[model samples]
Target: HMDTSILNLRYESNHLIDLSRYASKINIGSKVNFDPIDKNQIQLFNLESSKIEVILKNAIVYNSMYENFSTSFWIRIPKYFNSISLNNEYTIINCMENNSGWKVSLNYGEIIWTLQDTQEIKQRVVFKYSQMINISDYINRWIFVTITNNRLNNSKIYINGRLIDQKPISNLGNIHASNNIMFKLDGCRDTHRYIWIKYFNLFDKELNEKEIKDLYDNQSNSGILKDFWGDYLQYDKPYYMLNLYDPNKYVDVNNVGIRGYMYLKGPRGSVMTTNIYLNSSLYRGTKFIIKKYASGNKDNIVRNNDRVYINVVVKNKEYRLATNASQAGVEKILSALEIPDVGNLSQVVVMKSKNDITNKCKMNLQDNNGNDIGFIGFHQFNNIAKLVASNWYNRQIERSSRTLGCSWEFIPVDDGWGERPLQ
Candidate 1:
């Protein structure tokens, strides 16, 4: 259970989107070409063709007749084109276009905020000279950008929780071009270049410095809105989220499911663990065990009360045994045996591939005292079983000879005839 006190208190107040959560959700654009650097983090790539963007379920139509509205997002620019030319316009977010909606973009070595109030009197705000020079310092890193509209055309821009620039707006209430909100690229006004956005929140009124600071600080942790109530504040409307691991393209958190392909370009994502314990069938069988469970049958469930653990060592790194696809055949055999955490002749067994038994991996089964029980290399064990069976057969045949009164002893050939040997 999560504490919802602060969340409920800020209910009527602090209305914003949980951008972090949405980033991991499903979307059409989340046709994940690849996986992220870490499972805990979501990676946004500048694909040659398509990239993910969020479009609200309905247009957040802020009729100019009404005064207050603002939008904010946290982003990190991975590819810095630090150009002061026309191409420097890296659109962060925009309302649907034709120069109707407001947008935040990186332009000419400075952070620029532009609002197309009505149409022509297009208001533009630029960061101060001192601030503009240092603006590029945020590339390959994360920073906060907030655009607040206190009045019809008046707005303020904040970077990393501090006010950086301000722009004036037109008084025209009839001019509305881009009312729908979008992120990164492919929205209303212009398209943003390659970037990672954690959140994109809209506020009905201008947020004060304290609120902006809180929002900035809240993003330091994983999970969306970690500083605030996560998944607690329920709203009538639904927002979008992206999941690169999903089978579907992209996910709509509130509506449908989507999981784009995970980008496997770089180093494999961070290590993640799932616990598997005693009485697990999949771990106990060989190839056949996997075939049963992998069929996607809901009725194939195995349960056990024992908590005995199997310590798995891979590449000298130790891990508690967890079931994985590639190792299904190995897990099948281990899962069937009821190995107690306590009390064992003890066993640290080496399970190897059926095809190439010599290619073995170590699995530790501990005794009750938590001492090494034993190690069984499957290939060697196979040979051991054969030898033992051969010995038993030899003993059985010798017993049969004795009971039939047959001479089974080897004697000297062509030497003596008494107890010696027969020629």
Candidate 2:
């Protein structure tokens, strides 16, 4: 399996936009514009004008020990652009320091990838787009492009997730590692053309064919709510919640109970009663919903285990709640969280309160057998200190309340509790 943690740099313009720290804004030319195409709702960078380049300084560090590397992106070339001339070459992406690195460009209706070693020896693998796929099919349409080099000296080019070309290259000397190494996009000196680019990613490992195809399929629903929690809880959906306590103090496996609060999507909007509690003894798929106070009548119920998955992403590095989960999974989820760093878990907890409530913002867990587990009272709180204190009191009152069949109304909110669909 490829280690996804080596996804060193990424630049995306979509549901969750990201620009790497190493990248500098367009310093020399017209500013890049963001516009949505008719094919998909997600936005893409419009480098349709002349003299535009986003430089990535030290974005990729190449050394003699380098073994594998891969880069992928989505692009669309308008039909009006004339790419049939053999003398005309449009540089799409270029990385070089003292003429020793790599570049991907378009030449004569073909995608050309060129790599240069420290000795300035150039090797290339060309994908004839016109021959591989009908020229008419790719024109004016979004297409996925991926180029990968493996440890075994194999170079490959994939078009729209399909392998189009592969070759062997040897004696790839030190590929120019320097602080001055720069990567430029759409920066050809003499070319003025229009191209739509989005979702550029660089990986330090060779991604297999299956992973490439999955990436192609993921673009269909790129604007969905799944972008909030990535890769984690791969089987089930995610729900937003307000972490009541500090992650540093609360996420310990030993300290368990109601650690967070969730506003269920009610008839009007977000209901203010659902609390996400932690209980390890209960089955992984247990669902708790009260009848009158806090009814769990939503279509998609997010379970306690799912909440546990979110907690793990929030602070799993220091206090690991789920010992069985992989490090890559946690890292991917944290990246999707879009927090500054792992040290700012408290910041992420606070930011969830301001998240888009129209999305899946409730919690109710169900088992594979489709059985309702039990009911538990729900309450809302405005003051965080009161919320924390009341959660502590609820831990003590829960056993008696369940046995006595009594309910509690602690606070009032704008939107009252009621069942609503997961929009």
Candidate 3:
């Protein structure tokens, strides 16, 4: 699928990297800044005096991740806050889009959420006292908030993992984004806002009531993020994960992003925080029967610890045994032949048929007792016991067209007229 998230922040406790389905998880683990307070808690945004923040390598890569009609964002507000003057607005977080990215700033008595819709329309939702009781009071306390927008359905706002407000989307136009896009945490690329927060998450789809509450309930657990996917959802797909608490300096723990050497910068430094936790057990590719069968043949095909060659038909061509391929090596031969999984096949038979060659051993690939099955190919077997022992991998030659100059095509041996062994 061409679909990719510009910035996927599926935060766990200690890792942050991208995991797109069937695609590579773009690792940006090295671009995070945070500190671990203890086993149960970690400090995400506590920068003071400095404008330190997290930045991305390629910001334009994130532009395609967002859609004008879809909206999904989440964040846990910090426990402490410093009131900002009207002239000084704090834009904590941003995305590849400068105007459309999510921003948190001061608004008199409460904090307001500026949910930029793509790149154009700037949507604003006020977090009044009724929703969470004067944002100032909620400060210095744990608060979980999320914005869910599905274009058709009413966009929702959640606080403390609970739905608090619902409204229609404010903008429904094309996104206005810039090239060489970049994302900054705890501050804007052009603004002087330094965000002090706990954790942030970005979802590709809308979160239901239960999905939202689950985050709130599992905040204290180290494996809380693991609960995000399991049996029900298509959770096995690749996703982004980042961990700042126990960051790896030498390499990205989640195994994504570029190796060392940095890029991009804002007018001033910014402060930010994060997590990406990918269970190694979830990253294995698919397995096929061809490899298994090839491996088994490699072990049994040897004689007195000596290598032997076998002739076989592969992709409508003649192929002779090459080398000693262990269980692993045999796979290469099978690859050349493009062997399909024979497990589903019912019955296969080798018999005789009249064509360009005479007394030819023809293989029928079919089910239903080999009824009306297509011809496998023209083959000649020297030893049936040897064929059985090798499972058709033996000293047999299969002709693609017909043996070059065999006169069996002109002379016919009908009605059992052959003279003993002499044709």
Candidate 4:
């Protein structure tokens, strides 16, 4: 029952990605590597100030990894689409290239099917080149997806909200239907292509076109969709983009590039509350490892009481440049750390001593040898400084920018190793 007065008013927020707090939440196991997070992806897409992209790139798709869960969302594809090309299978996949992608599962009363669909997994949707189908023909439709027991029915394939010509060749199941959703995303574009997803809608019952649009557009008059939408009921499948703790009153978590914050969710009034840390996940984890250049202990290690100090090396693995068998495993590990508003784990930038390429702009610098570090090139400082400057939540997160509303740094670079430069 939203107000119909507003027609084209778009929903927005001045959201920036919060990386530090995100990684802290994931401090569950030492084995989970959250280092080297990408700072560029640590972003907030502004509505009034910027554009909210419904279409995303390098985002994870919900798959059937966990049992007894479901995911639904409303998408407004282009209206110019007329028909699907039958030449290929034009699929919707749940691919997890590296450990960072997603896991898909099908289960009724019992587990029926589960697939990680790593980067090697076949694309869920192709042109169905055999049939020469062109899905673009139908757009601006409300497509509903449900997993009951294990069968994927109720709009498995839709053409403008209408059923497509080809019947679903696959059936998950019947009987005591279990509610479980799936996931997808392949190895940091490292292995496969990257795509974007817009909505994450979990409803008790299927929604029609009118109802879907109402929720998708967030109708101006809030009476119907607002009244009907309920709490997430999935047992283990928590939300990846739906931030329950968003400080912004107007920001719609579903529309644009809202990084899912690292908050663990559970049953209402449930005892435990947790956060996901991005420091050590295998895929795209950003860490700023550092140490002060004080006397005696020139090495990158200093321990006082319980506090450990070391040369501040910063880094995040946005996308792997090199490929090894371990690459896929890393993607899966990163995908497990998804949270609301923080979205998936792509903002993991790193500035390690060995990897940071910070002194990239060298013309303005001089090396310790007085031999003109100009020849050092972008490979000079290893990017450590720049990554630290970008990934630290203090300088980049939206919440800090909005609340502090001002930037202030107290720690002046003591002239330890070199003379400090003016900011």
Candidate 5:
């Protein structure tokens, strides 16, 4: 901690596509990106609606067998406490910005979470519109029905992650989800498009007013969630997952570019090697826990490297674009993504790199002691490791100690695949 050099490098996206997806790590998983069109600028994507809705209706959907919601499951940013204990008031967000469609109801399922009808009876939550100039086009705010601390907590309405001075719920009782749980977006039979969700973790626990205010910080940074609530700084919301759809191929995608980006502080002459932090959490090699899903979702390793500082890590869900590689000290983690149903039909046949995507993409990020920060390399991947359980595969580092002082930016692979819309 006392031997590294550090500085905030100004980031600019020189070769950008579009600004519509959330940044990496929704909770920290950003919908923002380095706007290459804006000269390497970083920005987030627009939450599109209307026509694209039908296109994305069933395009991206996930059903985790972990938790179950009774009649009323969660819909807003998808962060339920991950448990179903009574006398708990879990937080829910209604992302239908600008006070629009979709009516959420209590689902009647096992391992249930919708046992409390506080939302229906007390109107503790509701959805309104977000007047933010940037995203005024779609999605307003949402309401909530909660029961926290064995009390009927107020029904709160948040507009773009902010508590709008609207209404509050009254009698929130000891609510809990039953064993039977099911979730439906606007009632089964149909799905939603652009369902960008962020999660705050809890276990049969609900957040109070102070917690919500502090958690959101009154909607700072454009409704982007920060690591304020968790005491352990466990993981970023939405973890770290995204869709990198490219067109012209026989894939289920559009002529899209699954753009990726990250950031880090660069310093020189530090004792922090990739091991002290990355190898061990206590800043000592003796005790460390390499985070799982290092690619996304509670994704991050405990690394403070002097060899090379990997400032950021981001990727899209395109199997080929992110697969087929080998890290230095680690195995080839992560699998290739599925193809877009009807987009990007160019037959890509690039073999996985024995190293990272490119040499330039490797760097020697140092702390203050002229030590080697863990090296970072960003490559055009496609199931490189061919191991895709989505869990951050331990010991999957591609850069070796010898490649410590390498660059971390990969050159464009296919001549841009070039121009496109939505970019």
Candidate 6:
């Protein structure tokens, strides 16, 4: 059950070419030098500086059993040179026995993997003409690259933990019949362009997507936390709280309820205002007031403090519901609002709130009769009466628009809501 490979190379300064198990360093070209800022990466200088090549002798030989394999590395091209012709391909890694081995090369900002048999040849081009822009965007930054060939599946190429391209490998047989293999790295000695390479790894077994992503995350050393929906604080529709009377007038402020106004742009160049009230009752638990209006006429409405709101229309009456505060109460309100799909409002156990705060809640959004819809989050403001939905709520709205025909729009808010810090 182990996927560990005997060939693992780390480009640290002290033991740059001493990590591979069975491979012996045959040559280290003068054009390549250790990166000053990161010792783990080696910088291959341009062809005009000196011919660059790292060669290994007696490398691990492939056999009939080596049908499935994967290789991964991290590379960064800091700058492109005018001296380097676009027609000149840069070979990153090459392992060949006469004319039958595999090689990975870069041509015109695209990664190409070529597999050759004694007479037949196959190539998988990742990020071709249409995706050249996407590949060029990562030119100056370190990007993880993985190529996996499985006998049972297609040969896949992954960049930055994401699968970018793949091709069927039904005809390409096992890569074998190599005795004393010659493995080369940074083999594009004629290309004037330079690159930084690190962590060249080889696995005898094919790696799945999760395994490839894990390898990327573990080796990239990027500190940014990965979020499924991206930045959490960015919201389309923001809500702000407003008070009509003094707070001291109410004996029980919670029982009296808190009101707020949400402004949005309506359809056909109209502005919308939505009024929301959260009332805490000793008898009814908690009740909500949902009212909407269009700019001069009357309504529009709608974060996370992890808040998600589901703006739903039932029986021609529009209601804005919160997912965080109470489940039973929300279900009862949906039932009273005549929501067609109110069979069960189950809490999402897999997705947790942003910070594990008590006020954050995530629930499943469903249609009438409880069919799987999507997910929604409800967030309660820290010190104000404002409630907001997450950015994912926009996607929910789009999904609902197609499924339920609800016409809800999230207009950008510029003032109070934008000024507050994300909770």
Please name the candidate that would achieve the greatest TM-score relative to the true structure. Answer: 6
**lDDT score, candidate 1:** 0.35
Q: TM-scores, in order shown?
A: 0.41, 0.43, 0.37, 0.22, 0.25, 0.47
Model 6, which residues run further than 4 Å from truth?
1-3, 18-26, 48-59, 78-84, 129-136, 177-191, 221-423
TM-score of 4: 0.22
Q: Which candidate would rank higher by TM-score, 2 or 4?
A: 2
Per-model CA lDDT versus the true structure: 0.35, 0.39, 0.31, 0.21, 0.22, 0.43
- Model 3 earns a TM-score of 0.37
Top-down lDDT ranking: 6, 2, 1, 3, 5, 4
What is the alpha-carbon RMSD of candidate 3 to the true structure? 27.1
* lDDT tens per residue, model 4, 134-231: 11111212222222111243223222233232223133221221122222321221121112223333333334555443443342221211100111
Write one digit per residue (lDDT tens) for candidate 6, span 152-257: 6578888877788888776765555345322233545334456667777778778888898688757743322111111122222232211111111111112111
Per-residue lDDT of model 2, residues 97-143, tens digit only: 67777777775556787888888777788876441221133543456
Query: lDDT tens string, model 3, 304-423?
Result: 112112223322333221211222311111111212322332223322222221112232223334332332221222221011112232223445323221101111111111112110
Error of 3 at 235 (Å): 37
What value of lDDT does candidate 3 attain over all alpha carbons? 0.31
Candidate 2 vs 6: which has more TM-score? 6
Regions more than 4 Å wrong, model 4: 1-70, 74-155, 165-184, 187-192, 213-423
How displaced is residue 316 in candidate 5, in Å?
18
Worst 10 residues of 6 by lDDT: 243-252
lDDT of 5 at 393: 17
Model 6 has how many clashing residue pairs? 19
TM-score of 2: 0.43
Task: Give stretches of model 3 more than 4 Å off.
Answer: 1-16, 19-33, 38-87, 96-98, 101-109, 117-120, 129-137, 176-199, 220-423
- Model 1 misplacement above 4 A: 1-26, 30-49, 57-59, 79-87, 128-137, 170-172, 175-179, 186-193, 221-423
